[PDB]
Amino acid sequence: SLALSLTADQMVSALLDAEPPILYSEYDPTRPFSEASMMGLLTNLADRELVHMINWAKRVPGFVDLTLHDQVHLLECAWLEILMIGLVWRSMEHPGKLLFAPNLLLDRNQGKCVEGMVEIFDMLLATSSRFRMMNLQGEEFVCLKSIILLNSGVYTFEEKDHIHRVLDKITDTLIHLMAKAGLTLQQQHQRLAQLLLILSHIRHMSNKGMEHLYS
């Protein structure tokens, strides 16, 4: 295993290099402004993101050591969470708006076009505003996104301990970044807790989104 032997700096650069591209949405002026057209735009965008997310997951340290069967299970549990934390991260510098794509920036008013999506839109906007208040860094973001991949399906499956050892190293990486930025030990502990508690809200948003998709 190469994951358990990486340093903190090598872990960050590895995750940064695996970052998937920022895709564009379709810009079809022949399509009307309707709910089904909006849900078709978001569905088309998410499907193309999923293909890049699978390659990105292969490059997350420790994910290759898993069995194929497990990899399928982690991705099918966390895929909407990973899409959501990516969207939330892209939307940090656009207050009151969600940057689904550079050519698809939506506020909560436009989110009313689909029934029930406005509540999830507000939750995503609040999560984005919280990241902006905390001044979330990209190195911290790729750490949180790798935690989601390894943690979302670990309690619903020798292997579970390996995932937990990789998770401990990502925790060592988050603290290493915070101590590097000049934070005191108490501030390192507090910021670590603040970030991981946001993952509970991202899990909540994903579970609510799965309900509407299954409908």
Partner: peptide, 9 residues
């Protein structure tokens, strides 16, 4: 599963 094939390819 396509998730199988994409993880093998």
């Amino acid at each position: 599963k396509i998730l199988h094939r994409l993880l093998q390819d």
